[model samples]
Target chain A: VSPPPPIADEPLTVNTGIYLIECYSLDDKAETFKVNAFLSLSWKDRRLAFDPVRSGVYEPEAIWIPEIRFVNVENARDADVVDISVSPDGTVQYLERFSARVLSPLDFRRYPFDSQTLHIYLIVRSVDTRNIVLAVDLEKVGKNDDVFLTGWDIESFTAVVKPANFALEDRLESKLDYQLRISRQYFSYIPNIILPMLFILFISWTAFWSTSYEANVTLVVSTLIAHIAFNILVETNLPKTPYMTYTGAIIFMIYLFYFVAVIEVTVQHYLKVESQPARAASITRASRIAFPVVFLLANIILAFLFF
Target chain B: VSPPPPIADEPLTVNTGIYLIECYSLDDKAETFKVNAFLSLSWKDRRLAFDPVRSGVYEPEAIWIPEIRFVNVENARDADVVDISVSPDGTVQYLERFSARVLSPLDFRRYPFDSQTLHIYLIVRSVDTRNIVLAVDLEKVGKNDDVFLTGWDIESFTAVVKPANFALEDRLESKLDYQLRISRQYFSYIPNIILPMLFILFISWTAFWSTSYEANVTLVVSTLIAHIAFNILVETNLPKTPYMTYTGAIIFMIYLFYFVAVIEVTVQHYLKVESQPARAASITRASRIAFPVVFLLANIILAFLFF
Candidate 1:
């Protein structure tokens, strides 16, 4: 089969739509997701026109069909032709089911509270005989009512109506973008990470209520070790990025609190040993109020900066 | 249409298969999961037989179709008929896509390290015209390669070949079980819940090192409060079950250790106030070794009992 010849120098428009059947495997570290959908294409070819009263729909192999490909997929898509039918006026409709791993970048700055717009790019190359333009068919661009991405709430699945046209390798190319908008389900993170981390931090602050150097050192140092464990555990869930995430900044800020708590505990012991008991007690009294106040203020600043 | 009439007294067997397309939202609290899959059924019907050279496949409404329903679904399934084809040998093939929230109980006894077998129950009730029995077609009983349940590693999706025949409401009913085996991804829980919990409990034991009664009081009492917070947080993730979970047992046991530490702290204070310094020191020294050793032994026993 050859490319459909254009009439009056007008380029052929291939109307396309994607209906999602299954969406899964949204890997945060890899920034990729797997999708199964029905890709439908329609175009007109005057040569295939027939009398409706006498003839039936023609086979796909008997007519010309546009070659479409995905731009951001990891590799060749797994596709199976579902159906191909031609109307009496030579309007051809083609449907195929394809599964592909799409490569899309994610912004982790907001992290568990993040929203992402994932894209699936479709394109067609211009053949020597005619230029092929792509378009979005709103009627068929939809997702199954039961289509879901686990751990994520899908907001919308839509396509850009206007196609980008440009020259590539001395030939014209048309591209369309399909977007899947989603947001994270962050309910588990509160009990799992945030609250637990906060509890340990507050436990370290109990050192201000004590005057014993041995006990204060144990409280601050042991909780610091536990905080370090949390930091390591949290880092494992994310990719190594140069940018700091909302949780990352808070986790890093906590190390400073631990270090300063140790400093206060050491200073209080030295002052008491030097017979400056009144001064040491005053500092301890001030710290009991300062540590929690500063922690709340710093968290507010970080939340504002990230959100 | 009605069910196909049997030539003899034997029940009609409807061979069934389920090919999973998407599986998501495995709710731990509700013991439910949403599924999207292709449900296929085949059976022999002599009334619908045709000559291959003279006749075409009949429409679904033109012949008898078995009434198959999901026994374990929360409500009526959302299903769409895909295709119906009949062959010359009176063999009928039917396919439909269905999505439903399946209710299956989960054992959280070893939660965070747990493995579960989720089931989808298919059933057919007998009619006055003919009795219907269910059978598994192994060739089509499968899941998509991209089918994933977030936070869980799916081991397999299989069906039991034999059907359970039982009487329901004075009529014979046949049931088939489709099992989905999965294990928890416990990597996050170690850092998020277990390690953080252990760290706080170990910190309470530091009261064993201090001779200052006030400092010891602050140490055990403060860490105890933190442990209580963790307990409350952990409980929110699960449903109210009468049975004790593995983590629940460990959490409850840790409370005893905290109470013992508080008791030891109080006894040391009373001994010191009574001028029994030597006795207080010896007791604290022995406790330093005992708390950790007991914790390790108890954890080993719990692991043995659960795993």
Candidate 2:
């Protein structure tokens, strides 16, 4: 039979450490994203019932430590080499390298411009908080990258102990919450989304200078189509989120300009039709200056609000 | 030792079933959705040496059943009370009701106005398919809901048997994939997004009749801000996807109308400025008819493409 688990009046403290060997992918839709890493779970095996086997370092199979399993793990297998050491003393060390689907509680308030913290909570299900004490291995906590993440840059990593409450009073009740902070790589979106957006706005602005209805209409329609394309481009990059991002705000600005240009020309046409030729002419004279000034000021204020 | 696990001379079939009680919440960005449900996991226990305890219906305690655990589960507790039945023979049954945060694989390609199929996969981690066969509980498999889900409508539910592969020679395994088809309740977004957008386009169209440039400019800028507000509203509801929705395409049409208005008036004034007064007057008269015809035809075509 398996040996009886440790019985402690106070919780048995477990030191949890992590090495983020590499993060190859981050999926926004599935909170359970793919991550590859090396984890070191070190806890003292004060129960010296099998001290005879502790003369030197040995793999976990050669020891008598109670099995501590991971929860919320989709698929966790050894990443590199797998070995655990039980020292001559009662202290036991388990070093494991694994690639897993980490199920994290993610918040996406800022989206493409937002920073997110991914968490991995490790718990011993058969023990209780009264029997287990979880601690973070602070000295060796941080992530290493082979090649930087595709759409995100790793910010930092943290380790902390969390209470895992169970229905039964005697069951395992403590877990480790390992946090990894990542910020989106937004500079790459500039040329594809931002620059094209700027040009759409500028080209629509040119409608103010073009003299013929035919030419002006062509400019406005082309600019409108370009903005639509940009809208689709931005949409493809991010998931559906409730909050507005800087890119979204900029797209809105372009729509505002395109619509305003349409309103101006429609008014000028009717003013002449209503036997108010002078008023129509005056509007054209003012528009050459007014439209540009209004557009510049609106964008400045928008940039100030967002940046 | 725990009675030697089920023999694997051939694969064993386990009947798996799920009842979706309610959907507590679904977050698009994190894709971490909460669901409450009842699940039944049943597998044959050929080791009936302890069948004396199965003379009548009894909870799982009286049977010598392998510990079947839940995977991909978040906070699944005993809900609505827990009970199991055992037959005079060796058949053992386990019934559990729980509220949990299910880490599901979500695809948001068509968001907001999109339909999504949410999945819950149940697997027995410790045992292999050679020992346990997973089948669907077709009779009691479906979801129930409260009207509190703010943005979505429950479509339907389907339960099916999925193969779960393990470390074995003949690896035809079995699991359950519970699918819940949900569609967004787009009516909630209608008044807040669609109506205001239509108004912005209609108001800009009115600029065609206004006689003064000052009045025209007011209409243009006011309509412009309104369009911006509506744009922000729509962006907040949908994720950043590449394709355009019916509403987005319609908004693009409005931009076309609004921008076309500005172009017509600007040309009317400029033609007069260039000393083509007669030509400008003739064009102005033509715009009153031509603009409407173009807008109607464009909308009809836009409608066909989307609807």
Candidate 3:
């Protein structure tokens, strides 16, 4: 027998929690988000961990405290350790407020109308799962907190002890994920992109009303350039994604509407030019009511299917 | 003063070269390409340098060998050391055939009409420029060799020894770049995507000649559905990119043509329904010629500007 097996110390359990101050900024190209928040962890080291009432030392000096490393933070920094205390049961607590920029790959398929859950993970690299067990302190955490984003609404904030498997062993990891529901700010997209586009669609329909062939052609062609400019504006605001969104499909519909309007007027003009005035008058009369109704109906269906 | 600075051994000038067997697969999503090739390096070890011609032995045992590490292979493997020879001067040679998949970022804004340069690097690690200098054996390597790729063409292959900067120190590295040109096969896209779309546009135009109001409405709506289906097909075949392509623009043009055709017929039918049969006939008669001419001209201009 191998000389009596060595005794193993039980793993220390750390009660960790986070209070989300705010997620203030997001970058699409680099896939990163910034946060201002407070993070706290309490664990018993036993050697330094002691009750202040019995030991007369609640706030520990730097020399008496165990070093804690925050790993699994992608691109982050500047944590100010503001509090350290020992409780009655030898529980030592450490609290810090941090301004961090975390890297996260985001899926932008729905884009302007998209929801996202941003996650931040904290890992203590020096400790293994067998030496330390991390658990979320649900009592100190807020489940649904009031938070604001420039283009989104905060839905929920949650924390969990997510253990990770390493090549050599296992490690304790904690994660904080904040879900954001889009605000559907029609303010930016409508006035800047949609309104101008719909304005041109109306112009195309109106051109169908114009009896003068020359004016109709000029209006229709002018609308084409305007529609293209709107397309560029929308494209620049979005990231390259594989699937088409409702916005992309609708823009194509607008393009079709304008194109058809031009053709309608041109045919009428051609009929007039070719001595078919009676036929031209009849087509023009019907187009005034039919075009707008059809275009509006298509958009309703597109919204029902995709939105 | 330094014991004559003991005459330093001259750096070995290794004759290294690569033969591209074939680039068998390419995946844009992962930004990776697979290739099979032969790589060989020959250098004088000096320690076991010998005259093999006089000894009547060109191949040597493992005890008389020089070790070299492939330093720049990224994500690749499957190498078979097929040949090894030692010359009269102890110049040991190593040749190996390898199948490797290498990750390289590709820009595809102009895909289907874009040219790309794929690079592979060879770094002779565990040694520095002070001990080794890689020289390209241009005669044995390629510059513009015959190669075939699915949906692509091999334009040229270039090799060179370019020193790279390292955080700790500078290192010498060899690189092979294959310039690939896209084979914009119009046959598949024209027949499978564009033909059916144009056919619907033609049908929409023909429906304008019909006097029946209900039939005309039915035909126009059917064309709309068909256009949307074709759009889905084209989008799936290509990856999303920052800029618009000639093909995408042309498809939108088709959609617009069909949309206007429906409007033209609707208005004509309305006039007939509203007791302006003569006017309806006139517009339809004129549209028969006018719609086609205007639509074709716009396409010609769009093709000239974008295609």
Candidate 4:
């Protein structure tokens, strides 16, 4: 069936609402999420108008319906029609349940503490009979109370009321953006990644407590290898982005600490062997304080910059 | 509305089915998962039967509908009636879309390599007029092709056809069990937890190669501290269970390796200082091979037992 004819040379405004039933499978590497929702549409069609006492509802196949589609979906939505009702005054209400894998980009600059706005774009192209414009039905745009996205907190789900009107291929088009804002659940990472990483770094600093060259080498080098392992593990959990994340910067900075620790160990040994025991001892004592103080200060700087 | 009168001495049979639309948020800590699905119920009602040519489907409020609910849900399911159809022979079909948080237990014995059977229980209570029994409709017991539980593989979704008949509160009740079998995605744990853990243990074994007492202490003790950090980190990812997991046994075994390494380091130093250098060298060289071989053999035994 074709779309309803426009009246008074004006574009037909097709109001739309999306009520989310389920939101899940948010993949960081693929930048995608899976969604199940009810899509509701309303418009006026004088052709379907009937006496309220005579008729109740109509089937979708027997009447005109707008051809609506998602702009950012991986494929066509899997949709099933639920109901179609026309009032006596010719107002039409349509509802469908649909599932879709939406393509949405995420920012990882503050990774594990990042907040992102995911978008779902709805669009309608103009038909030969009439140009259709999209609008948001505020009252109907909502999500189920129990809607959850695992390992993340859902902040809000809202739609932009003003639809973007543009022309493509010489045909008028209307687009509406639905946004889902979410923030990472970072409690798990603190124990799993951050604290363990800090423990190993502090273990490496134990080199300053001893003057034995061989012991210091074992201390610094062994922990350095473990740090490398951690870096590899952390990288696997995230996508390979061109920009550095907050955790990435800290992880990279730690390598420098290990390298400098190795330098201090070697220099202290050389001085002691060259008959400079007092100087070597002084340097070792100074580093015992320097390493931890610098580490604390640098972490504060990183946290402030990111937060 | 009241239940339809029974035709014979047999109990009323209500056939049930569940088609999953979304399966997600499988929380290991909480032992729960969120689900969105279609619950379908069918029964015979002579009072609502009509001539096929004269009528279509009927509204739920106008006819008798069974009170069906989930037995394992955290609260009453959020549900919306989708459709109700009555056939000329009095067969009635009902469909509703529902979202629920289902509580199910998990076994952490194998942990990252574990497989679990999640359950959804359906129940119907009998009315004084008749005892209601439940039956499974195999054709409708299924899941969506795109249904995904993050970080896990969905093996199957099936229903037990035989309903468990039991008495409760002086009335007969019927129950149905729907199972969702899944296995963990253990790929990430290999690099993040297992291999990194092995690397640190191997680094501690480097102490066997060193003759310096201070250096040996540094090697084994530093790695031992790092191992403790890893243990704490791994524990946070799992729930507290009374029984030890396969990984837990392996982690505990590692502490013994570190302790023995400390003993060997001390023994070698004592013999050397006591003027028995040759014997000290022999024991140190023997330990270099013993530690790694024993580690490999123990891991093989663990894998065989767990797998």
Candidate 5:
């Protein structure tokens, strides 16, 4: 059984005729359940808020209807073992009318971590007894056990998902769990939590505002410092990540730029031109032209990231 | 009036209840008339939607509100521009309230952006015998208004913010937009977005995999090819940006690393340690540890990015 709850973020508040409820259809045979069914809204709380390292499940004082949803799970796709249904207040909602659809089968084969939301529901379903008043299946079996179903509903059964993770594919031998988290660090921290690229832009802009072309060297040093600081900051905030972070890429590039600037200034005497004035003019002209093309191409080429 | 709407990448579909309404209580004093004795949810054209850009004062649908709202202008915070009172229609509870305020003046000097909701109901003390509801006084306004507010909504007296784009500060010169956007090619596209990084990585890895010790010069040539390819690619994408991008930095570093590797192999040759076994042993014992650490450190020291 799961444990108790922690202090809430704040008192639950709602503006008018809004009620928040969470309910799951639990079945031992099917191994799945749906939670928080409402006429206008339906949702699930698979992992129920708990410290990853802790144990317990607590009912929400009230659920706020989220205006935005990440909705990573649209409906069970590949890697699913079973399909189930959902309902409101023990009343089964038909498959056609079902509003919530989970995406891929959750990969929670490992213990503890595997005891995530999807898997924990099975522990819950084991206790629920569906006393069907209507002419429903008493045995709680699928219409056809041999056939695979794309969707699930809340009737008298459980829904279980198949498993997969990038972790199982990596071969770094030591600290596999930690490494898996590192691989996903890009997803969790950079995109969803903190947008580092946007912030670093300020540091780069700060380099721009120093107002002294004489501080050409200063700009490079500052840029490099910016890169070094962010790198250490990222390392400290998370476990040592193995894969490249978007933040990492940004910083590396900036520092590299700084180094090049340093070298250019050091070697500027070698690349003589018509005169010193001409040499300086050439440098400025080159930078002005190079900066734009490079920046534009960078953004457009970024289209390849997910692909 | 603002010009025609620009073509948008994605058309926004607003949810039904998430709309805004705004009203200006503008009635000329000489044209004042006794009007509604009560306040209630009134009707307006249902065609209004949130399409602000294309609309101008002289424009069609310059401003529209799709959401339903009851406005009270007494709480308008500023002096009332028109007198208003409220009364209920029989069964409706708190409908009757007289206009406690009068129009100070049609002064937009105090108001910039349109406030979303002010359910102001006016009870016209009396009107001209013509029953004209005389034309309201409105100063012709234009884009040059000093107090320019960017975000506005009518029905929701509350302000609305887009996800994360801050209203860019005014200091950034328009001429630099192209320059900034294009410079990204050097850093963003070249190292992070394009396949060139992967290609180099694969080439380097292939070199690593192929020969153990005896093929020192072979690996050096391959690395030189990678570096030179990167240099040419960088030169092509950028307008000769004054500073180096990640590609330039990494490519240059690779060149230096290759040079160092060549020197090390030469030293080994001078020492007569040219055997395949000798080469592999030296690299495994030194290069493996040194290269990963140096490269990783170079990547990590980018801290200013966050600050």
Candidate 6:
């Protein structure tokens, strides 16, 4: 069953490691303790896990290792916490802290048992915690590698906490709601962009179905519109200062190339009209191939440059 | 013969109240001294002023008005300093920080002079004379604007410092060198990015110069390469994040468009070989106009929508 998870606690915690082990935070002041609140807590924690993935894999990570995750959730809330482990001699040894997130897909194959309930503990930090530096439990929540391939490989695990006093259920409920709303919001931006672009990219593909400039003209213009829209939308998300963000640059480049495609499509269609049918047919063929490549490479270049 | 600057008995202190505002903090140690030192400084008798603009305009200014100029040459070993003034209401303040940029051309029509000497001082919280901010000031040290706008409007100013043996010459040297070095360092990142881009953009412009596939291939490949290089260079200067910055996004778009142009030129030329060159040229001419406009609008739409 996929090599029995390669040891559950071998590298139990990573302190001199990169990425995050766990994160938990709370902000009660933002409206009621509804779903939005839950999402904020979950997201605040998730950002810690996600942001550091880009911060370099080894070496002391450029991103901060969260204070929220300590050896246990309960141990994370100290105003001042100093963890020192000693050998035989009673000497104040060394102090170290950590947080980690491993985003690989969950392994479901290893657990031969029937669907076990995975009880995830969501500890919403106290409402009174003002500007609290979150101390975390690395052993609790870690990474969720999305099943981007085919099927889910990782089995979900349950969480059960001792001494039910930590508001675990309340925080858990809030986090569930937060994740739902956030996923919707982030993906919503994607649809508005992707739909129009599909139409644009597909226009030349079906050029054989229609004749004249109607299809070519409509498609080229529409695609350009979509790319432009996407480009501008990307800009707003970034601080308006003069800096290059990897995402922003990639998005911009995508459109720039798409815009070029529009140019070629428009011009090639024009030549089709004045020339004979044979001439028009040949020009039409070239336009179709040329147009899609514009977008494809814009994206390729963007991906290469960015990811 | 203009009126001479007023003589002052105490250090001429001015707080522009311009915060050393960075959207994010670099480190807390420096920040602590910056924020608290202002509070620590005794404000019993502090005044703020710009240089004497007119030869004798102090009549309108409250006698307590600041007579601002910088002092202390020769002593470069002193800590970096920030000269500021707390407003009469302790709300708004002015900082005579200048960068090596001309926001507006020097209004030299009024005062035409060169090699003008300037001096400035800032009195601090007197509870402990040691309670002072950094000796280096970031504001005073920018390059003269590209226009070389003269600071000629300035005349001799005063900081009424209470009798404290001060090394004016040493402080001046420190101040000048401090400002110049930091300014050069801080603003230098711009040209490094801008110059390389200018070279690439110039190459992209050459798309109009060549006629065949050879030129088009170069254009497309070059555009893509430039974008890749740019993406990397941009990250070096900025934080490696996903958000887009203005300059970065714009350059990214330019590179993408270059690719499109290359494709258009090549394919359109290929179409010419297939049938009628002149007729093919005519059609491309028409489409060229329509294609760019459509995408341009689309880009705007998306930018606004997402933003």
RMSD to truth, every model: 12.2, 11.1, 15.1, 11.9, 26.0, 21.4
The Cα RMSD across the true interface for model 6 is 18.5
Which stretches in model 6 have alpha-carbon errors above 4 Å? A1-307, B1-190, B240-244, B279-307
Report iRMS values in order. Answer: 10.8, 10.0, 14.8, 9.8, 21.5, 18.5
Q: Candidate 5, which segments miss by more than 4 Å at Cα?
A: A1-214, A231-240, A267-276, B1-307
**Candidate 2, A1-307: lDDT as tens digits:** 2333556555567776777766666555444567777777676764433446435555445554444445444433444436676545566777778787654545554445668887676655233223556678777676664665666778877766767532321233566677778888877777866677777777877776655554555566555655665665566666543334555555555666676677676666666666897997898789888877887898788667765
Query: CA shift at A133, candidate 2, in angstroms?
Result: 2.8
Kindly report the docking quality category of candidate 1: incorrect
Output the lDDT of residue A15, model 3: 79
Model 4 clashing-pair count: 0
Which candidate model has the greater lDDT, 1 or 3?
1
By lDDT, who's the top model here?
4
Docking class of 4: incorrect
DockQ for candidate 2, C-alpha atoms: 0.08
lDDT of candidate 1?
0.74
Candidate 3 local Cα displacement, residue B249, angstroms? 14
lDDT of 2 by residue, B218-238 (tens): 555556655765586467565
Higher-ranked by TM-score: 5 or 6: 6
Give the poorly placed runs of model 4, Cα more than 4 Å off.
Answer: A50-56, A161-172, B1-14, B17-307
Q: DockQ of candidates 1 onward, in order?
A: 0.02, 0.08, 0.04, 0.09, 0.01, 0.01
Which should have the higher lDDT, number 5 or number 6?
6
Tens digit per residue, CA lDDT, model 4, A179-219: 98988777656655676577667767766766667767886
Can you give the lDDT of residue B278 in candidate 3? 95
Task: Please write out the lDDT profile of model 1 over residues B103-128, one tens digit for every residue.
Answer: 99988888868899998887775787
lDDT of 5 by residue, B1-307 (tens): 2221223422222211111111112232322211111122221222233243533101113432122222223332221111111112211111111222222322221121112122222222121221111111112101112111112221222222212222463222111000000001122343432444434333332323223234444434544554455445334223333444444455556666666666655565554454566765566457645755675576455222211
Q: Which run of 10 residues does model 4 chain B get worst, by summed lDDT?
A: B163-172
TM-score of each: 0.61, 0.57, 0.52, 0.61, 0.24, 0.31
